[PDB]
Design a protein around this ligand. Structure first.
Ligand SMILES: COc1ccc(CCOc2cc(C3=NN(C4CCCCCC4)C(=O)C3(C)C)ccc2OC)cc1
Ligand SMILES: [Mg+2]
Ligand SMILES: [Zn+2]
Length: 330
């Protein structure tokens, strides 16, 4: 042939939703042969013309994306390549928000998307606290500090050194140093221990919000530009409850499978069982309402204020999903 197979035709039709909140990312995983991260990253890179802008050879991009996707664990229910693909596509939609039109450079866009793609790579499906309490090698390497997030970054960068994997081979030293610092700042901000400070700084920025004549956000210094990118990827990472309920419930099934598996490993070893990890002493519905009330709603309400009114339908879906879970509390 020279034209797509029939499976490739159906995948290409699903990928027409790539600019929309609520992409059927599970269907894209099935149709791509478990390559959601590769096909979604490729589609986004083509759509945003990043291959031409950064002179990325297409074979090098595909080789790196497949290598990165392979270092996500297929046996981990939540922190896998589908979650990476989801956070990439969600970051992509947030970057296109009208309140941010023409705010970010091509290099900052590349940073936010690359950061999203690598942000959980080689996740073992247990928490930082589990790795610290078991005296894992990873906890020792990173001195018990943002252990997983340090590891995600180190693997994401290290994989650029595999055969035909250096997608940044044509960037100048100045571009690579700036890209690298922004990617590190974004992924380290995905550690939930940083959530409260990130949210305080986003709130401060909403109170002192400056807008251009075009009605778009004004971000002068690096500190403000990087805080917005950090909160954007953090929002993408915490975007599950803002999705149509059929998607949210698949994410909830997956995180609860992963948490219960950690709880089984803790109970086996006689360790204290972590919050929400005890399959015998769990209230999935109550936990989701608490997650939304204390973490997700305060973050997304502050984001919605920053980009008012672009996020109103996302905030509405979140409040609808919150009432659905509340209404199922036994
Ligand atoms: C305030 O009461 C809460 C009540 C419930 C929860 C989590 C239950 O749901 C989900 C949780 C997560 C995550 N939970 N956390 C951490 C949250 C912060 C405190 C430590 C526990 C783990 C993560 O690092 C990620 C982002 C992977 C993702 C997707 C979920 O549903 C689709 C959290 C808090
Ligand atoms: Mg993470
Ligand atoms: Zn994540």
């Amino acid at each position: 042939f020279g034209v797509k197979t029939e499976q490739e035709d159906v995948l290409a039709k699903e990928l027409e939703d790539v600019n929309k909140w609520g992409l059927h990312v599970f269907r894209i995983a099935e149709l791509s042969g478990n390559r959601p991260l590769t096909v979604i990253m490729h589609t986004i890179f083509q759509e945003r013309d990043l291959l031409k802008t950064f002179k990325i050879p297409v074979d090098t991009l595909i080789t790196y994306l497949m290598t990165l996707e392979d270092h996500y664990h297929a046996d981990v229910a939540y922190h896998n390549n589908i979650h990476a693909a989801d956070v990439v596509q969600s970051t992509h939609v947030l970057l296109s928000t009208p309140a941010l039109e023409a705010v970010f450079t091509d290099l900052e866009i590349l940073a936010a998307i690359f950061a999203s793609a690598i942000h959980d790579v080689d996740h073992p499906g247990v928490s930082n606290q589990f790795l610290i309490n078991t005296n894992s090698e990873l906890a020792l390497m990173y001195n018990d500090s943002s252990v997983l997030e340090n590891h995600h970054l180190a693997v994401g960068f290290k994989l650029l050194q595999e055969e035909n994997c250096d997608i940044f081979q044509n960037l100048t030293k100045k571009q690579r140093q700036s890209l690298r610092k922004m990617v590190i700042d974004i992924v380290l901000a995905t550690d939930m221990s940083k959530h409260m400070n990130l949210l305080a700084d986003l709130k401060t920025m909403v109170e002192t919000k400056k807008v251009t004549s075009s009605g778009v956000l004004l971000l002068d210094n690096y500190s403000d530009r990087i805080q917005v990118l950090q909160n954007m990827v953090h929002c993408a990472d915490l975007s599950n409850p803002t999705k149509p309920l059929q998607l949210y419930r698949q994410w909830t099934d997956r995180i609860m499978e992963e948490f219960f598996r950690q709880g089984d490993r803790e109970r086996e070893r006689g360790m204290e069982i972590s919050p929400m990890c005890d399959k015998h002493n769990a209230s999935v519905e109550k936990s989701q309402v608490g997650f939304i009330d204390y973490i997700v709603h305060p973050l997304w309400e502050t984001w919605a204020d920053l980009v008012h009114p672009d996020a109103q339908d996302i905030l509405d879906t979140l409040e609808d999903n919150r009432e659905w879970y509340q209404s199922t509390i036994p």
